[PDB]
Write a protein that binds this ligand. Structure first.
Ligand SMILES: *[C@@H]1O[C@H](CO)[C@@H](O[C@@H]2O[C@H](CO)[C@@H](O)[C@H](O)[C@H]2NC(C)=O)[C@H](O)[C@H]1NC(C)=O
Ligand SMILES: *[C@@H]1O[C@H](CO)[C@@H](O[C@@H]2O[C@H](CO)[C@@H](O)[C@H](O)[C@H]2NC(C)=O)[C@H](O)[C@H]1NC(C)=O
Ligand SMILES: *[C@@H]1O[C@H](CO)[C@@H](O)[C@H](O)[C@H]1NC(C)=O
Ligand SMILES: *[C@@H]1O[C@H](CO)[C@@H](O)[C@H](O)[C@H]1NC(C)=O
Ligand SMILES: *[C@@H]1O[C@H](CO)[C@@H](O)[C@H](O)[C@H]1NC(C)=O
Lengths: 49, 97, 142, 49
């Protein structure tokens, strides 16, 4: 998802299923590369729980 | 006078053994007591504007500081749900006294 | 199962005793819910059995005293509690009341109001001194 | 007249497992709402009467 070479244009924005897998969100939130990382019904600190 | 008394007490048994509703003044008290506790348990299911009605869904999902803004909504609405129940019960207790 | 625990199922945190349920969850369900909007049954995500959640035992506690002028001796009533749930109130399962000398027992009594500890049951009837409930009273006497 | 609880000793015997679901008194009790017994039992009221 995040390192795929080609992103979609916003008029035809892409949608990928994430399923039957473990998600370590501490790796995603620890990376300083994200200029914005805003969670709207949950805290990014809790996503691992 | 005795036969009329014995026949009149006979009709108290026949009435109480027949009709379903004669103690309606006492069943109303039980029904009001039960309705007020069932209403008080229903007010736990309300959000009051919090993201959930359940503290475990707030404390699993939010951090220590974003949770308190949700927890205080639930505290404020519940605290008013108890003050309503206890005010209704203090007014209702004076009817029974 | 059958012990008070901090559970967490798929992120659904809580506190309670987990118990073998007889409920019949359809294949699309994961939690059962209460009139209060709290969960009360859950399907285990590793072995697909249904667990009844029940909260860990609790009740009111009430302290019976002849007053500090007469004595510092008191009796304790655990409201709506069977006597067998006070041996469950052992210090290994740390309770909200930190004090526990009552759990020494020998004067445990069962009343319809609750479990009464530190008061001696007697067959003599007297005028009601301190009212305990369900026909029982207590008093400080020789 | 049919009563909805009377404060008589909810032992943790019945209300655990099955009856937790089908009885309003367990939903009340589990949320800190308890009924207390009267001081005079219905036998003591009948002795006075
Ligand atoms: C006063 O009223 C009573 C009934 O309220 C009368 O008693 C009845 O008398 C008739 C015959 O006249 C009997 O068939 C009934 O069985 C009696 N009933 C009872 C309860 O005994 C009584 O006769 C009246 N007396 C006068 C003087 O009028
Ligand atoms: C307190 O709990 C005990 C069980 O731990 C109850 O004892 C049982 O009572 C029933 C009905 O009389 C008997 O059939 C059982 O054989 C008893 N079991 C044992 C191990 O003795 C007792 O009735 C409860 N008392 C109250 C008032 O709740
Ligand atoms: C959990 O592991 C067991 C094997 O130990 C397996 O039978 C079970 O299907 C697993 N749970 C899921 C959701 O697959
Ligand atoms: C108890 O109160 C009485 C006054 O009513 C007083 O004379 C007595 O000394 C008191 N005793 C104690 C132990 O407080
Ligand atoms: C009360 O009386 C019963 C017999 O009816 C007896 O078994 C019991 O030991 C007595 N208790 C006391 C404290 O006297």
């Amino acid at each position: 998802v995040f390192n795929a070479t080609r992103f979609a244009s916003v008029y035809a924005w892409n949608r990928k299923r994430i399923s039957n897998c473990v998600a370590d969100y501490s790796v995603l939130y620890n990376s300083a590369s994200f200029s914005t990382f805003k969670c709207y019904g949950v805290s990014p600190t809790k996503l691992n729980d | 006078i005795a036969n009329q008394f014995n026949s009149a007490i006979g009709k108290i048994q026949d009435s109480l053994s027949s009709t379903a509703s004669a103690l309606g003044k006492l069943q109303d008290v039980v029904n009001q007591n039960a309705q007020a506790l069932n209403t008080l348990v229903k007010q736990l299911s309300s959000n009051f504007g919090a993201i959930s009605s359940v503290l475990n869904d707030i404390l699993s999902r939010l951090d220590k500081v974003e949770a308190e803004v949700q927890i205080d909504r639930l505290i404020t609405g519940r605290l008013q749900s108890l003050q309503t129940y206890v005010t209704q019960q203090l007014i209702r207790a004076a009817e029974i006294r | 199962k059958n012990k008070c625990v901090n559970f967490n199922f798929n992120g659904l945190t809580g506190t309670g005793v987990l118990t073998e349920s007889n409920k019949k969850f359809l294949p699309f369900q994961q939690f059962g819910r209460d009139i209060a909007d709290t969960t009360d049954a859950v399907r285990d995500p590793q072995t697909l059995e249904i667990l009844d959640i029940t909260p860990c035992s609790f009740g009111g506690v009430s302290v019976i005293t002849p007053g500090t002028n007469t004595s510092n001796q008191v009796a304790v009533l655990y409201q709506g509690v069977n006597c067998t749930e006070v041996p469950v109130a052992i210090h290994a399962d740390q309770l909200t009341p930190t004090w526990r000398v009552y759990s020494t027992g020998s004067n445990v009594f069962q009343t319809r109001a609750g479990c009464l500890i530190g008061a001696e049951h007697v067959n003599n009837s007297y005028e009601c001194d301190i009212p305990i409930g369900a026909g029982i009273c207590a008093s400080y006497q020789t | 007249v049919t009563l909805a609880d009377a404060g008589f000793i909810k032992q943790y015997g019945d209300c655990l497992g099955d009856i937790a679901a089908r009885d309003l008194i367990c939903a009340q009790k589990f949320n800190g709402l308890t009924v207390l017994p009267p001081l005079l039992t219905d036998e003591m009221i009948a002795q006075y009467t």
